[PDB]
Amino acid sequence: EGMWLMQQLGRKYAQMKERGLKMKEYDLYNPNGTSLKDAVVLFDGGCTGEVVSDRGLVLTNHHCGYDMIQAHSTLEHNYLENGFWAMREADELPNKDISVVFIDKIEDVTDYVKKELKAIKDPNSMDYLSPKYLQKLADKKAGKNFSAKNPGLSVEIKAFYGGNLYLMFTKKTYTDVRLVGAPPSSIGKFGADTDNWIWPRHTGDFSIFRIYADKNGNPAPYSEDNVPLKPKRFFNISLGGVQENDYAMIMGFPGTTHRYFTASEVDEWKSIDNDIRIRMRDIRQGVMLREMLADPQIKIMYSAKYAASQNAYKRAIGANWAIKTRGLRQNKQAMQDRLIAWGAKQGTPRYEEAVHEIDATVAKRADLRRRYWMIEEGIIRGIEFARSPIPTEDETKALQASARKEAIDKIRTRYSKFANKDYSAEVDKKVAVAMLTEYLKEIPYENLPLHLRLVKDRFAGDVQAYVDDIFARSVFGSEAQFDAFAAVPSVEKLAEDPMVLFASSVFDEYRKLYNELRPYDDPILRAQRTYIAGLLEMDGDQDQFPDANLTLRFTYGQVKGYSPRDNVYYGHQTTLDGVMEKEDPDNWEFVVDPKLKAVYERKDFGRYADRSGRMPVAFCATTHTTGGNSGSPVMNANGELIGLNFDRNWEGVGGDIQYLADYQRSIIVDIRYVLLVIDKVGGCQRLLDEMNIVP
Amino acid sequence: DEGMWLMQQLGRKYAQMKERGLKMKEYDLYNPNGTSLKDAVVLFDGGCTGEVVSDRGLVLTNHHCGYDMIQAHSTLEHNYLENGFWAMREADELPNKDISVVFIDKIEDVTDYVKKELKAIKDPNSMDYLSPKYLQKLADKKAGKNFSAKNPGLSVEIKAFYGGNLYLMFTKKTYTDVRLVGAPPSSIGKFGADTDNWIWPRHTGDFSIFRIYADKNGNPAPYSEDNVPLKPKRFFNISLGGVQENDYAMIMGFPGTTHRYFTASEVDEWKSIDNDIRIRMRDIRQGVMLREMLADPQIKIMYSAKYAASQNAYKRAIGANWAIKTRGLRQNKQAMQDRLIAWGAKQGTPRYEEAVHEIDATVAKRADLRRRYWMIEEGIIRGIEFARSPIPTEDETKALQDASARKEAIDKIRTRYSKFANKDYSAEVDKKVAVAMLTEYLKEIPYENLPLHLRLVKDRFAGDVQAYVDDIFARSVFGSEAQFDAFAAVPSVEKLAEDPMVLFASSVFDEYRKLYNELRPYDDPILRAQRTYIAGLLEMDGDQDQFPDANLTLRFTYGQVKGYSPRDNVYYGHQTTLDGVMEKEDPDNWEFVVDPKLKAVYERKDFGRYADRSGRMPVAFCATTHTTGGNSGSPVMNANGELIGLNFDRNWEGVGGDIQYLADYQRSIIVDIRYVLLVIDKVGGCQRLLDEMNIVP
Ligand SMILES: O=C(c1ccc(Cl)cc1)N1CCSCC1
Ligand SMILES: O=C(c1ccc(Cl)cc1)N1CCSCC1
Ligand SMILES: [Cl-]
Ligand SMILES: [Cl-]
Numbered sequence A: 001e002g003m004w005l006m007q008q009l010g011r012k013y014a015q016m017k018e019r020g021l022k023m024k025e026y027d028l029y030n031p032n033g034t035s036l037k038d039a040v041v042l043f044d045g046g047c048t049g050e051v052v053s054d055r056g057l058v059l060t061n062h063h064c065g066y067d068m069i070q071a072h073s074t075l076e077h078n079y080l081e082n083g084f085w086a087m088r089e090a091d092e093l094p095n096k097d098i099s100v101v102f103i104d105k106i107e108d109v110t111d112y113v114k115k116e117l118k119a120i121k122d123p124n125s126m127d128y129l130s131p132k133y134l135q136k137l138a139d140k141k142a143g144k145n146f147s148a149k150n151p152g153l154s155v156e157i158k159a160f161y162g163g164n165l166y167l168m169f170t171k172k173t174y175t176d177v178r179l180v181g182a183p184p185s186s187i188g189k190f191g192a193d194t195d196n197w198i199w200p201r202h203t204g205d206f207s208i209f210r211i212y213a214d215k216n217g218n219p220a221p222y223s224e225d226n227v228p229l230k231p232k233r234f235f236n237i238s239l240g241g242v243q244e245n246d247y248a249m250i251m252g253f254p255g256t257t258h259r260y261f262t263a264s265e266v267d268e269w270k271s272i273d274n275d276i277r278i279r280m281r282d283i284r285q286g287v288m289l290r291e292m293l294a295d296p297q298i299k300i301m302y303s304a305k306y307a308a309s310q311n312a313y314k315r316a317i318g319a320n321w322a323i324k325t326r327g328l329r330q331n332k333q334a335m336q337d338r339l340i341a342w343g344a345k346q347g348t349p350r351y352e353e354a355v356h357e358i359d360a361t362v363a364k365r366a367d368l369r370r371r372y373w374m375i376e377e378g379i380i381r382g383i384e385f386a387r388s389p390i391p392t393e394d395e396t397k398a399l400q401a402s403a404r405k406e407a408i409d410k411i412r413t414r415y416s417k418f419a420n421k422d423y424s425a426e427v428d429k430k431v432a433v434a435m436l437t438e439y440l441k442e443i444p445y446e447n448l449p450l451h452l453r454l455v456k457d458r459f460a461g462d463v464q465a466y467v468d469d470i471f472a473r474s475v476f477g478s479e480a481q482f483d484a485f486a487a488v489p490s491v492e493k494l495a496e497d498p499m500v501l502f503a504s505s506v507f508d509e510y511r512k513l514y515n516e517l518r519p520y521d522d523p524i525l526r527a528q529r530t531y532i533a534g535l536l537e538m539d540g541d542q543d544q545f546p547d548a549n550l551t552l553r554f555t556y557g558q559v560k561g562y563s564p565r566d567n568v569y570y571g572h573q574t575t576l577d578g579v580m581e582k583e584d585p586d587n588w589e590f591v592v593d594p595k596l597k598a599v600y601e602r603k604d605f606g607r608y609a610d611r612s613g614r615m616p617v618a619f620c621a622t623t624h625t626t627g628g629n630s631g632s633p634v635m636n637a638n639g640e641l642i643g644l645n646f647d648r649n650w651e652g653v654g655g656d657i658q659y660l661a662d663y664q665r666s667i668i669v670d671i672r673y674v675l676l677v678i679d680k681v682g683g684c685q686r687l688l689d690e691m692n693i694v695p
Numbered sequence B: 001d002e003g004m005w006l007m008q009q010l011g012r013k014y015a016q017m018k019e020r021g022l023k024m025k026e027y028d029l030y031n032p033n034g035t036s037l038k039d040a041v042v043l044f045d046g047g048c049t050g051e052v053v054s055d056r057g058l059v060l061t062n063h064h065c066g067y068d069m070i071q072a073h074s075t076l077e078h079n080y081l082e083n084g085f086w087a088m089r090e091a092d093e094l095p096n097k098d099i100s101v102v103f104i105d106k107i108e109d110v111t112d113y114v115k116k117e118l119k120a121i122k123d124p125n126s127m128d129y130l131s132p133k134y135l136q137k138l139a140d141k142k143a144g145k146n147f148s149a150k151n152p153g154l155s156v157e158i159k160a161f162y163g164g165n166l167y168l169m170f171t172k173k174t175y176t177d178v179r180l181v182g183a184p185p186s187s188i189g190k191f192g193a194d195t196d197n198w199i200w201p202r203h204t205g206d207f208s209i210f211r212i213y214a215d216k217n218g219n220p221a222p223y224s225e226d227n228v229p230l231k232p233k234r235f236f237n238i239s240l241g242g243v244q245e246n247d248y249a250m251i252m253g254f255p256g257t258t259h260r261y262f263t264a265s266e267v268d269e270w271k272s273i274d275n276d277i278r279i280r281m282r283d284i285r286q287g288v289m290l291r292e293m294l295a296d297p298q299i300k301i302m303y304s305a306k307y308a309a310s311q312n313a314y315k316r317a318i319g320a321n322w323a324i325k326t327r328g329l330r331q332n333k334q335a336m337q338d339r340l341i342a343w344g345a346k347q348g349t350p351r352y353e354e355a356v357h358e359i360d361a362t363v364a365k366r367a368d369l370r371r372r373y374w375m376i377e378e379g380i381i382r383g384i385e386f387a388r389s390p391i392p393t394e395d396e397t398k399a400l401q402d403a404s405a406r407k408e409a410i411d412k413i414r415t416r417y418s419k420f421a422n423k424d425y426s427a428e429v430d431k432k433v434a435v436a437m438l439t440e441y442l443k444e445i446p447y448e449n450l451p452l453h454l455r456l457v458k459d460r461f462a463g464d465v466q467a468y469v470d471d472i473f474a475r476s477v478f479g480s481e482a483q484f485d486a487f488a489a490v491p492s493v494e495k496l497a498e499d500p501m502v503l504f505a506s507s508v509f510d511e512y513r514k515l516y517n518e519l520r521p522y523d524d525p526i527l528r529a530q531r532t533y534i535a536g537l538l539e540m541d542g543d544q545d546q547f548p549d550a551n552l553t554l555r556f557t558y559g560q561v562k563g564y565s566p567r568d569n570v571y572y573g574h575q576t577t578l579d580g581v582m583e584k585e586d587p588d589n590w591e592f593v594v595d596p597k598l599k600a601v602y603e604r605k606d607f608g609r610y611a612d613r614s615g616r617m618p619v620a621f622c623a624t625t626h627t628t629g630g631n632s633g634s635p636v637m638n639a640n641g642e643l644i645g646l647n648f649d650r651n652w653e654g655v656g657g658d659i660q661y662l663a664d665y666q667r668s669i670i671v672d673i674r675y676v677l678l679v680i681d682k683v684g685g686c687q688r689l690l691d692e693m694n695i696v697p
């Protein structure tokens, strides 16, 4: 049920041991010594990774190393579709803008931060959650020139439990992280978008990198003279596999959770956030699909935009399923009613007052929040011509010196980025007509972006005519229309351009709503500090985990399947047989790598198949994970690497608010399948040889 | 392989059934010379199975079996299809016109008799051995002079089995006054609707209740207000003990057809011609229909049923092709025939190998013709609605060419036009379907093999399929109502003789009939060789683990209540519950709406004695019994012969089971009798039906 602070390992150790943990507490996390924690990294600012060799080899997900594989792929060597396997360390490819962060030390600085905060002057100050303020405190505690005295290191203070606990992290950052190996996209992304959030899963979601450093193992930017890092700790790889009910644990960097939402916040998340995103994306995706299915060239141009919209659409469907079926609202109501009753008993009304302040703030911002999600889902992300070019104050104060041609070249560059190879004005007009029809029926005339008032005023309610007119008369309606403008540009033409005015109007309203809604966050945040303090004072800091905030956490559970619906059971482990059953040569998502298909036919599984001769692929566990846990190491009761976390099932996406023991699972690629792909698909024996593989 | 066994085969199967869990005495289940459980089984309305469940002739069958009778009695004032129907007294039960229930009174092996009569052969190639006319002449000869009058209600029938190697005579008792007694609302009776057709897990309460009526002596009689409920010689006891995983289960029913003795060449033909053409053509048709239904809510209303009707055999063909590809159906037929050929060679009898060769050569010879037939049938005859547009008859054409019979002909043509262009017909949707169907058809079928009118696509329209279809509607008398009325006002034979829609419809039906006539002769050599082939198989491995193909006759099948794994890491258990109905509820999707009375029963847990030991409410179960179409409504029995359920469907993974039974995938989908009695009790409130049944603890 939790994403626990490293500091909470002492308090949790006895329960973990009763659940199967065999390793010593300080071998997993030592606050003043080397531990397994030292082999975990924050990979490229949003994924987790792990050191698996004495020469700095790092494993993470394929979707985590995707951009680096794509940036090194060309028409001649397409590493994205064929994979990549450096046969020597010197062949490993450097990556620009990459990083790996080690969590060198973690300290509780609560009394320090709470004493510094006492120098208040304003009870409603938000400095207690300010990265700028907390950084000034972190620097004060570390010292004037800490990063110069300790190079490669940096400090950071973060708030936890709504501002009731503060931790300082001493981080070590390496920026020379090189691509070593990756399976083909057919393995690394087998399910592709059809199996996203799905269990059973058959995806070999892994990629291999290597941390490089200077001669002393100190952080250094890319240089041809950099040497692989010899880390202070790396994971041993287990080949013993997994069995149902086996103890499993994960360390990683979960991004966000909302475990202390009030019942009113659950209703708002359902009725505004999720219902609007669901309704608007269903309209958008419906029109896109119709057009993609009717024209194979539209399918090529819109496949990625369609897939990108489906991802949070599916998450919202999964989250609304939990609100409707798992009693999320009710359990938050029971949590707050229990605190209110205990507060009344102790003669302290501040907890009930705090819950009331949250409810009243939610109720007060309802119409504004509805208008914001409606314009964001409906227009800002729903309609492509909302992000069409808007002339800057510098560009209009140039068109009306010969810098007029420099303004036109800047506007032209933006126009070509909007109307790119994947942009269809006809498809966009069809999407806009459906999106705006829904938007105009939900947002009243007095709340509309100024230009959308023309639908009723000038176009007699004809949405099609309004959209047709934007493209017919706009300088960004077609290439020829832009060129005619570029030849004779006047500021009066841009000031009255229907597409410019639409884009300006919708962005003006989007920004006005954001600015009007931002002040409502602070009373909720301040009341949550009091609310979570009461919850901790009442039921204790053990069962109630602090919300995720991109900091290192541990979670434990077991390798276990679940029943998704009546009379259906999904086991704990998928096999290579499941990849073969899913093969569809004429569906790019489910194509099987020929070398992998041959390995399966010949049963060339070596030391990686299970005791029954079946080749495992993936497994699931009752660990509590979220976004940010993407390439997390999964450990045995002995702390050996058994897999890599890569996803979670849609039935558990509501788990960011309320953990669902009977449904929520972490989706993990089996380490035996990782080694089988490195060995029989990549033929990269040197990577197997540098790992410490235990029988 | 698992079996749809003849009643005669119960004796030789009894010991295996007992070892599998059967507890009842052999002759209590079937006795040729006395009353047995077999006497409580009926053929319901010529294509379903039913069962007598009371001493007053109450009959249980599926909701989809009694569907037409529930619909015929439904009005805007009393919609029994939507709300259900529950007669609170016997006099309130509704009569049905054109209904029947058939009891199998006696079954007799008449093989020696038929085989001796056949010896009077005039042509060794004669198909009389499979002729219903010939076999009826033999049945009438054996039964006696004027048997129908001497025994009212009874009739005799001889059928061939094992490709003409075994013959059985059936003495049938037919009742035609069968009244509607009860039915759940469509929300229970067809819960899955078309989404869950061929699907396990399943949550559908697929049952309906009827009653057999007869004269004062229990003898068959047509509907009369003086008819009294039948006091039958046998009825099923209802069990409330439920089912558990691995429990023995058995079914009696009337499976229609199987192809257990296909050669490997016939499996390849079924895959590459029958199934691939049906799959490809229906996917094109359904694809266009769906786009139009999704774009216009009025097109969705008009085409929903046509779309659903096409998807049914489309899904079956997808399931059958999955078995051919993954379960080794072709290979196992090849191994079956190779084993017989090897044994025949050792015996010095080459006639079995000669028979398999004759089947292979016939399959290879008819390939192009069969391809052209399935292509036109799936592509045009079924695929395009204007193929079934009006064609003026030879007498209608003559009637138009100096009498009052001109207005008579126009009224007949108008009636047919109004049936073609009905409230559900869209000419625009049909033109879109025809353009896609004909594009595929013109790609597969060469110019010299095209129906005459389709040659105009290349000749007159420069290959433009859209122009050809547009022209059919623009210039045709049946292209619109106004075009028909203009014709009806000034009708000339010369206008009909050159009508593009008439010529298209005529051409495609001419080609469809020419192909049928050219292909029909190929059936006979296959049939004759199958008689020799199945005789060899029976002589070699015995009439013991090789069941005779289904032929709409009474069979029994046995197995166990067991789930299965459909794919890697997925298990489907043996039993669904009322929670599964609730998880599937969608108020804005007509298929998954939940009856309010049923939803309340679930919330209050008002399950009475019908819930399982854990307090869960059972809905349906699946079993390793071997069933096919015709088994809808079949009684499912306990080891004690008590009714535990009604068969109503089978999973898509087992549709290949008509050729090769699939032990690890094929399951019969059965509605639990505890759920049937729960709906009668807590949803219908029809206590009198519960009271007349013999319910065992
Ligand atoms: O099948 C579903 C789904 C889930 C719940 C509900 Cl209520 C409806 C549909 N998906 C696809 C996988 S991702 C989540 C949405
Ligand atoms: O989903 C399928 C299906 C089955 C097998 C294959 Cl190869 C492809 C799709 N259905 C379910 C309804 S009944 C049969 C068709
Ligand atoms: Cl290190
Ligand atoms: Cl012979």
Ligand SMILES: [Cl-]
Binding pocket: B327, B661, B662, B663, B664, B665
């Ligand atoms: Cl099988």
